[model samples]
Target: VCEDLNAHCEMWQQLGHCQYSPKYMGHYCKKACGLC
Candidate 1:
């Protein structure tokens, strides 16, 4: 899921839904994006 979080963000950028919630845009986005 992380591998595609970037695309996920684009896919649902409006609502901003993803594999994770709440912290989706924060830890989820960064963590999933493989960022440390």
Candidate 2:
């Protein structure tokens, strides 16, 4: 399942971190990044 490993994932996701930080977000922010 798509799960966020970090507690601040939602916050980072809103800040466009998913775009700039694809590697980290892909693994840690799967749900947020819609990568699943």
Candidate 3:
């Protein structure tokens, strides 16, 4: 689950969603992890 979240978060971040804030980006990833 962590892996998937990380992957998707990285992808989103690459697409310019979180503006490169790894912590904030990881926060979004954590939220996604919860949903999964």
Candidate 4:
């Protein structure tokens, strides 16, 4: 769930990775908001 992502899903921080765009966050994340 969102808990795991915020805790253990890896801190996938990057310049290519972004938010508030409803964009290609897949290549940047695992279990995210909408996908949850």
Top-scoring candidate (lDDT): 2
> lDDT tens digits, residues 1-36, model 3?
444345577577667656545456656675433333
Report every candidate's CA lDDT: 0.45, 0.86, 0.54, 0.39
Tell me, what's the RMSD of every candidate?
6.1, 1.1, 6.8, 5.8
Per-residue C-alpha lDDT of model 4 across residues 1-36, encoded as one tens digit per residue: 333233423443233343453254454354542444
Cα TM-score per model: 0.24, 0.77, 0.34, 0.23
lDDT of 1 by residue, 1-36 (tens): 343346565554345443435355544455433343
Q: After superposition, how far is residue 24 of candidate 4 from its true place, in Å?
A: 1.9
Candidate 2 stretches with Cα past 4 Å from truth are none
How good is model 4 by TM-score? 0.23
- Weakest 10 consecutive residues of candidate 1 by summed lDDT: 27-36
When summed lDDT is taken over every stretch of 10 residues in candidate 3, the lowest stretch is 27-36
Q: List where candidate 4 sits over 4 angstroms from the true fold.
A: 1-19
lDDT of 2 at 6: 91
Which number leads on TM-score?
Answer: 2
What TM-score does prediction 1 earn? 0.24
How many residue pairs clash per model? 0, 0, 0, 0
Give lDDT for model 2: 0.86
lDDT tens readout by residue for model 2, 1-36 = 778889999999999899888788988988888685
